[PDB]
Design a protein around this ligand. Structure first.
Ligand code: HEM
Length: 152
């Protein structure tokens, strides 16, 4: 649960991402894959990537970063009223992709990391607080659907 002022911070931060969605999406995925190599094994289309240089050179990885962040941005713009947008993603991630909730924690922290790396000194403590709370809400509502489905 976020206040109006917190949502305002979230959507202000998101403007930084929307200025270069593919570059942010690429770096988020590279941070996830290099920090948590078990996550790469869930992607049949990226498991061939052995080095970070290959990851950086991959245009399909940048494409997928655009897909991921476009979906997250659409959810964030709903300011918590995201049941319809979140349900298909929860279902696909539990039943088809088999993504444990832990990996959603990993990517949440990776987003925070990338924001500081690309905007050092321009991602303030209030903005970090609000973004963290928004990603927690997203993760918690997915977790509720995972529990319904019995997925661990
Ligand atoms: C911010 C969180 C994320 C968002 C919004 C997101 C969004 C999406 C979207 C929109 C798709 C394509 C449609 C679909 O299959 O439902 C997708 C595919 C996928 N997601 Fe996620 N995702 C997230 C986190 C993750 C994480 C943490 C993993 C794995 C560690 C992951 C693994 C996958 C896989 C395996 C695919 C299928 C890729 C394919 O083969 O082309 N997702 N995701």
């Amino acid at each position: 649960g976020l206040s109006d002022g917190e949502w305002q911070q979230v959507l202000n931060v998101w403007g930084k991402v929307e200025a270069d969605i593919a570059g942010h999406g690429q770096e988020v995925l590279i941070r996830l894959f290099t920090g948590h190599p078990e996550t790469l094994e869930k992607f049949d289309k990226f498991k061939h990537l052995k080095t970070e240089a290959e990851m950086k050179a991959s245009e399909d990885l940048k494409k997928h970063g655009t897909v991921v962040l476009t979906a997250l941005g659409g959810i964030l713009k709903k300011k918590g009223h995201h049941e319809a947008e979140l349900k298909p993603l929860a279902q696909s991630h539990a039943t088809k992709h088999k993504i444990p909730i832990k990996y959603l924690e990993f990517i949440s922290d990776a987003i925070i990391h990338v924001l500081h790396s690309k905007h050092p000194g321009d991602f303030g403590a209030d903005a970090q607080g609000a973004m963290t709370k928004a990603l927690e809400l997203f993760r918690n509502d997915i977790a509720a659907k995972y529990k319904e489905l019995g997925f661990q």
